[PDB]
Amino acid sequence: AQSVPYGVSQIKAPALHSQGYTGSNVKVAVIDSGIDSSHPDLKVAGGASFVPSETNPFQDNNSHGTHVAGTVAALNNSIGVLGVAPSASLYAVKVLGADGSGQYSWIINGIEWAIANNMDVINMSLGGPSGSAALKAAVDKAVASGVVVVAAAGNEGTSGSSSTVGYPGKYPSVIAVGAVDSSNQRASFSSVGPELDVMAPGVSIQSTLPGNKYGAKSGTCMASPHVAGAAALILSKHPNWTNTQVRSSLENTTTKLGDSFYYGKGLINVQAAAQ
Ligand SMILES: [Ca+2]
Ligand SMILES: [Ca+2]
Ligand SMILES: [K+]
């Protein structure tokens, strides 16, 4: 039996699926710990490794990248879970090692790969406390080249009156995604600030794990792929739409929650966003 994870339904993804909008022919790059290409519920189209000691992008030694990819594109079948954009062309851009960490050089090389490889959507379920001129340049070029760039806002919670939004999420060109639970409440870990764009489900997210497994994870890292998945859904309907048009539609059609410093524009609604 297939299970539809809460977060899929919450964002109104099945409404587009019923209409035949499933993200077919949209290339989504999961810039992460790799993807387990061996998982029965995933179809990996390609990718590349930027981790010097872990040369195979289709070996997830972490679990992180397989779980992110399952949220985006877990196949519509009789098994496992259901992704947001189940027909999307999934790319494993391995930038993180087995420990879940990576060098800036590795991540930036991964972004650079994604631009050269004509990726429609980048998902970056990662962040750091500090930026770089090279990090900003790679995200900026990706947006200038027509790529939809989506990132996790961070898991830093509240800190006085300051923004706790990490990089690359902090950059204007990037969609920064915060976490809500099933009730539409902001998760206590969810990074806050003026740079917060949108909210998506990020608490106890059921997805694919390596070795034909399924399990839940929590974080803004879980919320991000819901937005990257939603961007793929829009593009399958409106193939002609710019990255700018995709972004404005996602932010302009949200279910409004609390204050923008905590919730940004609110919860994404792909059904309203797809027009
Ligand atoms: Ca499935
Ligand atoms: Ca922003
Ligand atoms: K941003």
Side-chain angles (χ1 to χ4, degrees), residues 169-176 194-197 247 251:
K170 220 177 196 77
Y171 299 126
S173 65
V174 175
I175 297 148
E195 330 67 5
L196 198 64
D197 306 296
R247 199 214 178 134
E251 289 173 8

Side-chain angles (χ1 to χ4, degrees), residues 2 41 74-77 79-82:
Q2 184 168 264
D41 218 30
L75 305 168
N76 187 217
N77 58 24
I79 65 146
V81 291
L82 183 70

Side-chain angles (χ1 to χ4, degrees), residues 242-263:
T242 71
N243 63 336
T244 313
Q245 291 167 306
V246 174
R247 199 214 178 134
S248 298
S249 197
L250 282 169
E251 289 173 8
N252 288 351
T253 68
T254 62
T255 300
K256 288 188 190 220
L257 302 172
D259 192 81
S260 77
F261 191 103
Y262 291 84
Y263 284 103

